[PDB]
Symmetry: none
Subunit: 217 residues, 10 copies
């Protein structure tokens, strides 16, 4: 049996997206919260229709389709998908994932009837990844310098923000943040990091060291 | 079954940290309040992601790892840890504490399924001590 | 009126796209005529820098979402 | 039977190291060339004594010892090392690797007699890695800008050199080179790359595009 | 003579293209050598504003008609 | 047998294009008039050479090629094209449409010999659409 | 059995490229000289790594990939390629041409073992054409 | 003479180390007395910036190679 | 009074340490509170050159004797 | 039975350290003189408290602890230490060396009762080496 999400929670989430934006960690946490139980295509579609504006909604439809297509390629690459079955008669078409299949168009009850739990969780993960892509797309690290009067924690916050909210792979953020701490961060802190008797191999360790030995002023 | 923390409480706590700072006794009291029920690694990780800035979040990840490593050393020093079991097959690895083990990465439901209550309270106490360290360090 | 919408000299492109899609979808056009009109309004409105940016598209853009994505990628940061 | 390396090749390699330096790719290629056949500890030791100065030679002795110690730790962690044997009587001590064991000190003939081919190749790989470490140590990408009068191929050469000869992981060089092409490379080329109707996802493709559409001047 | 044709300081681009194509096609060149010559004369004649406009073409123009279309699109209205 | 168009009509049409322009409805009507009987590639090519200036003629050659390529794509998408035949040996190549095929280059008589009426009407419609495109583009 | 090229010849060729440039006829003659025996992907890759700067090396990798792709298209267009075999099990993938296939990555001995002489000569001709393209492009 | 070697105000550290190790190893000292002398000459020569850099070493450096590596890591880039 | 002791601009560090340890041990503090107080007074008194010298200690100093030894090693000879 | 050192000798040694310094050979000779009979931890501790200033005394406590720890490592590396016994019940802990063990804290008589002569000579040699280290370090 299908139960809709509370319009109160949806209104609160919409106002959160309206004030904080799409990319804030609080907004992503709230979306993860409302993305806890496996949702039917109807639920996610209406949710994104309500919380997102028109242009972000178009972008999100595109991204969701692309991610679902990647999922269906992986599904035809492995007959053991939790959305698939063992025989060929349970193969899952994109009409069944997007809610376009027979007996599902516009009807959430029938949707909940015919859909598999693996189908639901795959749709949900796809929608979450698409939301992440669109949020990263809707709103330069190598141009960030520590100002002459700026403190170091503000500079570190700004730099980590710009590096993590960029187009770099996830495995290339820490080395870039370290090497930007070393070459930016005006020459007093540059020499402070250079003359480190220990080897600092993490942005957190560099931040701790600099905060300990910084010139109080 | 996993239930997320209210984004309203999280928003209020984030604004508290924003105005009062990390070290005020009211902020530590609020953190203790939102640290009442044993949280899953997913919950604490997202909470610190939201309430802390980028650099304090990096520092907190470091400190949390160190404290969890101390906990795991004490656990291998005593087979009667509320996170451990009696046999060797229940020994708790850091992948299970940080939420990196199999069946847990990114999934809070599976996390809540496989985790022990002793595991949860140990993770929670470790995160609280790490928050205290980072707060004492930032200012 | 959708046919009177221009991208202001100082307006960003996402605001212009929002306003245009709003006015086109909330109008008297048939549902099957909104996407071509939105595309052809992106091409002829949207002041000549973005006009030339869309014109010199090595790929063929056949959807408002694709045009928006392309323009957001290659736009002149300012 | 031990055969020494030609002093003519060694003299040419020494002059190469003297003019080009320790870190040039031509120098590393020449070292790889003279590091082709498995060398005895005597050979590599004398080679580094001749081609390297005193201080780089001290650094190289240190690094070679450390790498050989890592090798011996891996050897005691696996009894199937091509330097080891099956029984415990064939376990290889560092005195046998550094040429300090009995019947080997100062005598290359006896050295070649008692040493294993696996021992030789392990010593050789260790010495090569130590040479790489010392070369990287003896002599900043995020500070590289394209000068107002500099051409683009010179800027690209300098940037790729400084990025590949740095402390970044191998999987983080291409994204960094791309994002440095985009943010450095003074605003004419910045706008030229920004308004690319195609998506450029490789430094070579960016270089080709810019060379095609650059402002001839 | 085709190799002596320059775009005057005040002349428009369509007049220059007409004159150049006329002089190149009504000359002693083989038929298979007219298009490359017309292109390379568009690139080296056609005073430096249009020269830089053709140089900084994100797409590769491989036909006199395509070059003419591109220049007519992105030309400096004056 | 090939019969050329009157140079008097062509001169009048050229002066019409010279005074009224390319886009006037009277000019398009006159072009439709002189585009009544199916013309051979030689006829249309010389007609556009005479009535159009050099730069519009280059643009028109480009547009005509593009439209003929679309026609040939539709032809390979349907073996029942009035230019095609039933077997594969009657498939129409662009060398036969542009008049570049064997036995046609520069010779209008041989052109009229080997060409099909469907070929002629397709070439004519393509040339008309290309003229419309260039006229809309020039001004 | 794989034998490496002399570092003396490679050093002389690198200095030739450094003083004369990429496009001089003497440089192309020297490259043709060092391109006489069919080289393994390892050999050509290291050779271009040493003689070319970073940016020309990136350009050359691009051009070499494109030319090898054209070769593989011609190979799937003709089952009688000296790199191909008669059955479908000998069809040559780009991982085998670029040296990325199984048993070849980083190992020149295994490379020389599994590669065909037709494969080697095709790789060599592709690399030579790519060098010509990059030399014509750089200056 | 090894005991007269000083690091010049403008000289780099690797040149000074090369010169010092050369003069110490090509001298009349016993082989077992070269490393301690090289270390104690690194510490007392090698103008006071590097002197303080070696003095404030959280680790104990017991080899000329280790001292050279440490100084090359933490040296003042200039 | 121990909490009023500062290292003078011209005073050496061993004299300051002697005076501070004297005043702290000859005071009303419990015996278990003297070492932490002496350490935290070394860190906050002892004019900013030595303050920064103690701050940038690659090792953790957890005893007044260790702090004194470290400072005496790495002090600015003057 | 414990007999204290003469305060006259201690006063003379303190004035020697005050005028000649810590490193003079006469001072080291005087210390060796007053370090002739094996002293109890109480004796050496009070002696260094009197003759050394506060900061050298802190340094000396550190160095004495380190040297005693090296001694205890050598003792656990050899069960035939003159401070150790044959069985495991005579193993000497650092609380017994520094005078911190049970029945010894603050009482020199009980100290002299329970301590071994090997313990006394090891403590004495450790204290002498620590004094040498601190003297070499202070100036």
């Amino acid at each position: 049996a299908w139960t809709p999400l509370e319009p109160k929670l949806i209104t609160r989430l919409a106002d959160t997206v309206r004030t904080k934006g799409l990319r804030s960690p609080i907004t992503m946490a709230e979306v993860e919260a409302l993305m806890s139980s496996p949702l039917l295509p109807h639920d996610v579609t209406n949710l994104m229709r309500v919380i997102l504006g028109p242009a972000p909604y178009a972008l999100w439809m595109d991204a969701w389709g692309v991610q679902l297509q990647t999922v269906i390629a992986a599904a035809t690459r492995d007959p053991r998908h939790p959305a698939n079955g063992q025989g060929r008669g349970e193969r899952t078409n994109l009409n069944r994932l997007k809610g376009l299949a027979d007996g599902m168009v516009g009807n959430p009850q029938g949707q909940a009837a015919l859909l598999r739990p693996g189908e639901l969780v795959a749709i949900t993960a796809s929608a979450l990844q698409a939301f992440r892509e669109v949020a990263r797309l809707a709103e330069p690290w190598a141009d960030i310098m520590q100002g002459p009067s700026e403190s170091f924690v503000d500079f570190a916050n700004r730099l980590i923000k710009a590096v993590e909210g960029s187009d770099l792979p996830p495995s290339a953020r820490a080395p870039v943040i370290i090497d930007c701490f070393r070459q930016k961060s005006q020459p007093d802190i540059q020499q402070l990091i250079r003359t480190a008797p220990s080897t600092l191999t993490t942005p957190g360790e560099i931040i701790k060291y600099v905060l300990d030995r910084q010139k109080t002023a």
